[PDB]
User: Fold regulatory protein E2 from Bovine papillomavirus type 1.
Amino acid sequence: TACERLHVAQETQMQLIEKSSDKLQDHILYWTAVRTENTLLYAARKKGVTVLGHCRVPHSVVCQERAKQAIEMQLSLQELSKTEFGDEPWSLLDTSWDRYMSEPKRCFKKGARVVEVEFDGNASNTNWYTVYSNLYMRTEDGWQLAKAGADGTGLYYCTMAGAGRIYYSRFGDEAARFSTTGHYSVRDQDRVYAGVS
Assistant:
């Protein structure tokens, strides 16, 4: 049974990845499959199984972490499907671990654009940051929408829990990291901001 189920997990993944679904149901299924695969492989290592089928089994610490990662993704998305946002189009990329974990950590986000920070006046010292216009956050009152954006101070987001912008990344601090003057300017699209840490 362990092998059969393992194949089902792996087959579900490879197949879904080729689909590129809009349905959130499918992305829950994807992570369920990853969770299954890695848990089974974890259990196999803890019995001293080094090869299953004719496939080396990854070290338990690798299986465990991927299982943990898939667990969080799965339940998070299962919680999401139960809200108003669960009806929207959701992609594999919107549903990626890398998306979830990028800035700000541990929330879902879609609607991307790039922001260009230039330091010191040097065109050569230009960084690109990704703002996501929509953020989907787990809070004590459950999941709810937040809207992010950029300004001369940093990248921020706006929830209706407080009349204010909550910055998660500050350009002045980036200017400290990467610049030699403190001076930076911030191109959005048709907007340039300028600041000094």
